Design a binder for these strands. Structure first.
Lengths: 65, 135, 82, 78, 70, 69, 134, 82, 75
RNA sequence: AAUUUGUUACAAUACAUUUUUUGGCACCGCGACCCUCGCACUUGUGGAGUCG
């Protein structure tokens, strides 16, 4: 599943935990953003094995079948 | 009476009139202060050389009054009443520094002492409690 | 209950300084304080974040938007802490 | 610095403190809170303009936890 | 007579659009709660009135919401 | 829990300094424990009044500095 | 000392100190202790389902599920299977086991209580009869 | 149910932590509060293209911590048990 | 004293021209008629109109604007 | 020639919608001049003129 986030981070990851706050424990984690000081165009993404996440960050979660 | 870790740990610690530590023949073992002081008072000791410091990012004021400083290995450096004798011995201060005091050092009476300091340590704005002026 | 709150309450009467989220420092006699740091102050100067200062009478401030409060150093002595 | 468990156990230690605006408050923690508000004994706000450390001595300061980011130990007691 | 929560309840299984703290959305509402978190199907991402992408099945977090509309 | 003691400021014109470097004026008519303000209307700071009476939300208030003493 | 001995369905036996009002000693070796009896040697005989111990062992196959101590150091054990298990107190040996005749249900045959006089035995039974064993 | 509990259970772990302002923080979690206030030891602060700054002890606040990057080896199901 | 809740209720009863300001958003305002009431500042407001502020008029339908992002009311 | 028991007090072992921790985040000073000689506990501190 993919998650949109406040800081422009598309978090494509496998969900493990879930709560009232929409905090999440994540496996198989693959974030997507862009380190870019203007004018520039770069698209970057990194793999992380295991990752805890805070809920205020979360804007919209989505499920791609 | 070596400057030791144990010595530093029982030393008066307070907020001065900045965080200051109240303090010896050789400056050593400063690691134990843990870079927690803005000022260190080393007045009235027997240090010969201003050297031996660890990396101390906090330290902005060094009061080194009435010691025996004859050689130099930070915004304010007070060296009043020490033993610096040659203009060339003050050269290492060019690599630092806005407030500098070297009064009561033999070097003071050397011809052109003030102009020499000003040209070699241009970052100093107040020298011996007098404003470095443009002229 | 919060000891900082208590301290603030104690500081009532005294001339506290007071910066907000905006970064607009005030100084004045602390008239009233509440559990939520809802401060009122008298005879209060008001510095702009850029620099300029403005005198004003009886300012109210809501603790939410308060950043930090400076209290006079006499309160250090006694007798809230122990 | 010592290897503490909590903040409460390290009361009265000289503290570096960061806040959301980017200022750095330094001073001894006199008292803590349920919401991490800090009383600081001899507080100095240290700020950095967009160069080199600007410095302001405050005094006894109540500091709101909302704005607090993180606290670090500057030195030992006394 | 019409409060908000009941309106929200009524509007389940119907088209809705959401603005944020900004980008517009467009999708059929699945369900809602007291906190005003959302779950939508056939989500279309109106980037300032420009349907950039069609995500489909989504869950919007409450605090980023601005307003609901048909 | 406790009520904001604004009974001193009741029925006086106040500069409600509000979120986003904005302002409001007007005479104070009421309030609550969340510090929402109900006030008989005035201008937004050259100047232009909107409304007969106005209600400002609690969160939005930076300050409510008294115009009258 | 301990002036009160107690036995509970948590399968412990406590030796109480009443003046201070707290347990002096705990005896956990039982795996509910439904009966005790005081030897007229300053000790106690404690019971459980299959194992009758003593406290300052007694050989028992399953007797599960009262005790009485003669002044001659004979230790009686009433069964719920209707068997009367007599012991010596010193040894732990079981020298006799009897079976009562129910009455004029086979479930109703058991021994609810029992006592010795100040050479005779008196056992109330669940069959609505008292029996006197000589 | 609670992730707080899970967090608490995670003790003595050398972990990276990511903040709302993007600061990467390499340290050993000695403890965490019920409200996610992280208490680290052997700490290393780096920004997301500039030099590093190391520190012995850091108490970071719960509201700031965006993502705690967990250790390499971890049994998650077990942790999730009450 | 006139509480905020009471005021809101009155407004609802009336059905009058309400002009809402947005929290941390200067450029936009809303203009409609209050239909709903909540325990929090949240309400439903049918026949709403989005407005770009004078540093014209834009189309908008029926809306509930969420309580957290409200600032001003007038009715 | 410290140990146990009882009583009293304090502290520790709950939850997201406006005041804290479910975030509205991200992309006076430096040149000049001249005034004041005053025993204190401090927002700040002479004035004219130029530079930022």
């Amino acid at each position: 599943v993919i998650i949109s986030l406040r800081n422009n981070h598309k978090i494509i990851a496998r969900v493990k935990a879930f709560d009232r706050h929409c905090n999440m424990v994540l496996e198989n984690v693959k974030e997507l953003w862009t380190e870019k000081k203007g004018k520039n165009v770069i698209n970057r993404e990194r793999f992380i094995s295991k990752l805890f996440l805070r809920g205020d960050s979360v804007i919209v979660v989505l499920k791609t079948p | 009476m070596k400057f030791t870790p144990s010595i530093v740990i029982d030393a008066p610690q307070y907020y001065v009139d900045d965080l200051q530590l109240e303090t010896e023949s050789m400056p050593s073992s400063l690691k134990h202060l843990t870079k927690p002081t803005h000022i260190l008072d080393l007045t009235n000791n027997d240090l010969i050389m201003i050297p031996d410091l660890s990396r101390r990012d906090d330290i902005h004021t060094l009061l080194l009054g009435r010691n025996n400083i004859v050689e130099v290995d930070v915004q304010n450096l007070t060296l009043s009443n020490n033993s610096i004798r040659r203009f060339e011995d003050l050269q290492r201060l060019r690599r630092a520094l806005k407030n500098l005091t070297l009064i009561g050092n033999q070097v003071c009476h050397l011809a052109n002492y003030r102009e020499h300091v000003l040209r070699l340590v241009p970052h100093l704005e107040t020298l011996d409690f007098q404003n470095v002026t443009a002229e | 209950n919060g000891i900082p709150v208590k301290l603030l309450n104690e500081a009532q009467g005294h001339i506290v300084s007071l910066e907000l989220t905006t970064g607009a420092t005030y100084r004045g006699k602390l008239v009233e304080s509440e559990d939520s740091m809802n401060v009122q102050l008298r005879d209060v100067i008001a510095t702009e974040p850029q620099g300029a200062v403005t005198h004003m009478d009886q300012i109210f401030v809501r603790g939410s938007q308060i950043k930090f409060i400076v209290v006079p150093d006499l309160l250090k002595n006694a007798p809230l802490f122990k | 610095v010592a290897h503490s468990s909590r903040l409460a156990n390290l009361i009265d230690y000289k503290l570096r403190v960061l806040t959301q605006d980017g200022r750095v408050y330094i001073g001894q923690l006199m008292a803590f809170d349920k919401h991490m508000n800090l009383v600081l004994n001899e507080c100095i706000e240290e700020r950095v303009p967009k160069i080199k450390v600007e410095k302001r001595v405050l005094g006894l300061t109540i500091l709101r936890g909302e704005q607090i980011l993180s606290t670090v130990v500057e030195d030992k007691p006394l | 007579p019409v409060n908000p929560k009941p309106f929200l309840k009524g509007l389940v299984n119907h088209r809705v659009g959401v603005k944020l703290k900004s980008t517009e959305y467009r999708g059929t509402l699945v369900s809602t709660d007291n906190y005003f978190n959302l779950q939508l199907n056939e989500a279309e991402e109106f980037v300032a009135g420009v349907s950039h992408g069609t995500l489909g099945e989504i869950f919007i977090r409450c605090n980023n919401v601005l307003y609901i509309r048909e | 829990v406790s009520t904001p003691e604004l009974k001193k400021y009741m029925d006086k014109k106040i500069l409600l300094n509000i979120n986003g470097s904005r302002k409001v004026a007007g005479i104070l008519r009421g309030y609550d424990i969340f510090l929402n303000v109900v006030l008989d209307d005035a201008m937004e700071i050259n100047n232009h009044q909107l409304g007969l009476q106005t209600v400002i939300r609690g969160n939005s208030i930076i300050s409510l500095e008294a115009l009258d003493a | 000392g301990s002036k009160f001995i107690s036995s509970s369905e948590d399968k412990t036996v406590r030796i109480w100190e009443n003046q201070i009002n707290v347990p002096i000693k705990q005896i956990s070796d039982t795996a509910s202790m439904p009966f005790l009896n005081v030897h007229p040697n300053y000790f106690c005989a404690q019971s459980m389902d299959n194992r009758i111990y003593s406290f300052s062992k007694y050989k028992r196959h399953p007797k599960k599920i009262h005790s009485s101590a003669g002044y001659g150091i004979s230790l009686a054990f009433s069964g719920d299977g209707r068997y009367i298990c007599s012991g010596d107190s010193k040894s732990r040996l079981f020298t006799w086991d009897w079976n009562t005749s129910r009455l004029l249900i086979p479930g109703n045959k058991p021994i609810t209580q029992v006592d010795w006089h100040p050479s005779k035995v008196i056992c109330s039974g669940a069959a609505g009869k008292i029996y006197v064993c000589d | 149910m609670k992730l707080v509990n899970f967090l608490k259970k995670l003790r003595n772990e050398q972990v990276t932590i990511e903040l709302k302002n993007g600061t990467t923080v390499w340290g050993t979690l000695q403890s965490v509060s019920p409200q996610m206030n992280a208490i680290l030891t052997d700490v290393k602060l780096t920004l997301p293209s500039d030099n590093i700054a190391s520190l012995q002890y850091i108490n970071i606040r719960g509201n700031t911590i965006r993502q705690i990057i967990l250790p390499d080896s971890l049994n998650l199901d077990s942790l999730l048990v009450d | 004293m006139v509480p905020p809740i009471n005021c809101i209720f009155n407004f609802l009863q009336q059905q009058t021209p309400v002009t809402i300001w947005l929290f941390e958003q200067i450029g936009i305002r809303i203009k409609g008629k209050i239909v709903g009431f909540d325990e929090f500042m949240n309400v439903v407001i049918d026949e709403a109109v989005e407005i770009p502020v004078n540093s014209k008029g834009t189309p908008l339908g029926k809306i509930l604007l969420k309580g957290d992002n409200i600032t001003l009311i007038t009715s």
